[PDB]
Every structure is written in C-alpha cells, then in structure tokens.
Design a protein around this ligand. Structure first.
Ligand SMILES: Cc1c(C)c2c(c(C)c1O)CC[C@](C)(COc1ccc(C[C@@H]3SC(=O)NC3=O)cc1)O2
Lengths: 256, 260
C-alpha cells in the first residue's frame, strides 16, 4: 500500500538527515542563495588557498595537497554512507560479506551523487560548507590533476538540472547501495527484493513530489549509468596518480 | 491517455517486424527445438566450420580473421536495418539532420548487442539468418586477440535474456535507446528529450500490461542500459588493438565512420 512506501520514505529521509551533516537544502542556501547568514571563504587563486588554509579549520606541492584533502572526505563520507546504509530496512539482515560488497562498490557512486549537491557550475563547497573552491581554479592545476574534478562538475550540472531534493536523494541513494549486480555477491534475491521495494518508493516519491516533472523517475535511473561511468573513469585517474606520488600508515587509511 | 501510448506501442512493434527479419520469436524457436524444419547447423570446432561452408552459405585468410570479418559484414547489415527502423520513429526524421546522424552513431551499437541477445543462449549464438549456431566455446577458442570478442556479449546476454523480454517490448526499448539527449555533440537536445519521454511513457505502460507479475521490470530494464555502454567501450578499445596488430585486415567503411 502507498502508506507503506510513504512510511519507508519518511524513514529514509530521517536517517538521511541524521547520517549526513551537510544536506542539499542546507548547501543550496550557503551556495548561491541570497541568505547572508554566512559567507564561505572563497578559494580562487593559489594566493587564497594558503591564505585561507591559515584561517580555516582544515585537518591536514599544492596540486597534491589539494588531492589528498578530497581523499580525506572520501574516507569520511564512506562512514556517513555506511551508517546510513545500516538504517535501510533489511540491510543489516543480509549476509555480512554481502553488506561489505554492496558498500565496497556503491560508495563511489553515492559520493559523486551527493557531491552534486555541494556543486554549481562555478565551484564546489568545502569543509562543512565553510569553503567554496572555484571550478576555474581546479582546472588550473598540474596536468595529472587539472581534470580530476572536471568530470564531476560536468556530471553534477546535469544531475542538478533534475531539481531533486534531500527527500528524493535519500530514497535514490538507497537504491544505489542495493544495486544487486555488484561483483561477488552470494545471496542476491534479498538484495533485489529490497531494491525493488525502494525503487517502488522512489517512484511514488517523485510522482507525489514533482507531478509536473514527467517521467522523472525514468530519467533518474539512467543517471545511475552516468554514475557507473564517472566511477569507471575516475579509477583510471586514481591508477595513473599512482604514477606520480610514488606515509606508510597513511596509505593504509586511504588504500582504495 | 493510455490509448495514445498503446497505439505508439503497436506502431513501433509493426516497424520492428518489417525492419528486422530475425526477431526474437524466430530465434527462440530455432534454438529450443520447436521444429525439425528450422534446425540449425552447429559449428563446435574448426572441422565443423569447413563443413558448414559446404552446407550453409557464408560469403567467406585464416579462421579467426574470416569469422571476425564475418561479424563485420553482419554488423554493417545490422546498422542498415536499425537505420531503417529509426526512420520510422515518430519525430526522428523531423530532427536536425546532423543530430539524426549523431543519435545513430552512438545508438547503433547499443542496439546491436541488445538484439544480439535475442539470438544467444548460454551455449552459443545464431549465425546466418538462424541457419547456423556457433558454440560460445569455439568463439572463446580463436587466436589470441579474437577469442575474446564474443565473450562479454555472451555475458551481457545471459543476464539480459533473463528479463524475458519479447519483441513487442524490445521494439520500444530500441527506440528509447536511439532518442538520447546524453549523446555527445548533439545540437538541440530538448526536442530529442521530449520524444523520449513519450517513448519511455510507452515502455512503462507496455512493460506493465505485458509483464504484470514481473515487478519493476521497467526499472530493471532501464538499468541494463548501463551494461550496454560498458560493452561498447570494451569493444571500441579492443577494436583498436586489432587494427594495429592486424594492419593488413580491413574494416568496412560504414563501421569505420560510426566509430570515434
Ligand atoms: C557468418 C556470421 C557470423 C560469424 C556471425 C553472425 C552472423 C549473422 C553471420 O552470418 C552473427 C553472430 C556472430 C557471433 C557475430 O556477432 C557479432 C556481431 C557484431 C560484433 C561487433 C562487431 S565488431 C565491430 O567493429 N563492429 C560490430 O558490429 C561482434 C559479434 O557471428
């Protein structure tokens, strides 16, 4: 019944709010919004990063130090997503090796998804939204690194064209984690039974929440392919990056 | 209204029977055994193959290369049919002309491997209008580069075939593929994207009437549009290996053009 999907929907939004500090509705204000409640330090020069890097609350060559920090968050979101996943009804009851797998692979698609929420066409928010690093600056970086985030900007700008909100992404995010075609799973029926349930709940969500936006649920699913390619070809930089910087205890934190 | 979509569902099925002579319904009857009039000749090793040329017509220099140029000739004949089918898609011929070409350049191969599964099972694939059948094992067993071309298509086919789509559904899905905004180099994307909402609308309603028990098949089907791109990519690159280990073997120009 609809009452049950609407239930599971509210459920997942709630976990989404608890598990994820910086929400999209929150970041949208902080971004180009007109609210003067605060003003993120903008990073645009080389002469503004190191001037910001003194006054900010960062926890850590420049083209490399910039990369490493985008890796500090990846290791953070990995935890936020994991905690969110545990609240997805049935996820903890799956076989445990299977949970690790679903998360091993979904993490990289969940990250770029919610990164699109901190992104507009000119840059991206940083450090809980206390920063905005311009896209023009990120292109300007040493050749192994200059096209690091350019694909994610390009993809974000399309994904945001959909005008999803946090209530939409919550159910969307969940569908990714339950992909059920990940390498190496062992009991696949329950993963799919859950995904079907979430995919149902997504469909009713966008229909209730964007009745004018027609066939939006169908457009959203094909953005999941756009993601699987972003991640495919993001690994191809992440391998070639192991052909530049060439820590022991740190490499263990960041390994893969 | 419902009925507008069911009319568009019928129109595309009708173009589909007329544009493709090897439907999934023909393929599935040859493969099963519903007959003794349409049984195929099976090519399980080299020695079969020289006999199959006696008993079937293949207008075909070594074996891995002639089998491969075999796939080329068929590919070219495949593009010609999809180009024909595309022309029947309401609105497609009304687009900007440089865009028709673009949608076709990028869509033609996602579609080939889609309807290739119609002709595949776990054990092999139908060749020559269904007159033959080449074991997956034989295809894995060809010379170092070529014995890998068919395998991911076999892999995609076994998952895809599991959806149990018939021709009435595939006709709509093929047309959802062609009309894609996401194609690089497209001039005016809104009129394309507007068509596809309607094609998608049709596919959603079609997949529900034709497959009620099968929950979320529309969703599930839209997902496998990911696996196609991954097979095109894997091909394009492995196709570049051949053209430089094999600088004597040629490439049909149509294929050559639609391959940037
Ligand atoms: C003689 C013959 C063969 C050998 C045959 C097929 C037919 C119809 C034949 O008549 C079809 C299945 C098939 C396994 C070919 O299936 C493929 C079709 C396309 C492709 C990709 C090619 S490669 C390229 O550069 N562009 C393509 O379409 C690979 C396998 O082998």
């Amino acid at each position: 019944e609809s009452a049950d999907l609407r239930a599971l929907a509210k459920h997942l939004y709630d976990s989404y709010i608890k598990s994820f500090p910086l929400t999209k509705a929150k970041a949208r204000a902080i971004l180009t919004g007109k609210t003067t409640d605060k003003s993120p330090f903008v990073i645009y020069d080389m002469n503004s990063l190191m001037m910001g890097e003194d006054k900010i609350k960062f926890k850590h060559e420049v083209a490399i130090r910039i990369f490493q920090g985008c890796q500090f968050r990846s290791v953070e979101a990995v935890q936020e997503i994991t905690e969110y996943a545990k609240s997805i009804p049935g996820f903890v009851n799956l076989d445990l090796n299977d949970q690790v797998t679903l998360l091993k692979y979904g993490v990289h698609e969940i990250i770029y998804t919610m990164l699109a929420s901190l992104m507009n066409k000119d840059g991206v928010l940083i450090s809980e939204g206390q920063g905005f690093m311009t896209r023009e600056f990120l292109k300007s970086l040493r050749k192994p690194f200059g096209d690091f985030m350019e694909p994610k900007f390009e993809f974000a700008v399309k994904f945001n064209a959909l005008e999803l909100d946090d209530s939409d992404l919550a159910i969307f995010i969940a569908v990714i984690i339950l992909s059920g075609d990940r390498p190496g799973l062992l009991n696949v029926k329950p993963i799919e039974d859950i995904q079907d349930n979430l995919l149902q709940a997504l469909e009713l969500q966008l229909k209730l929440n964007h009745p004018e936006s027609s066939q939006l649920f169908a457009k959203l699913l094909q953005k999941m392919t756009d993601l699987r390619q972003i991640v495919t070809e993001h690994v191809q930089l992440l391998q070639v990056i192991k052909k530049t910087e060439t820590h022991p205890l740190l490499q263990e934190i960041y390994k893969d």
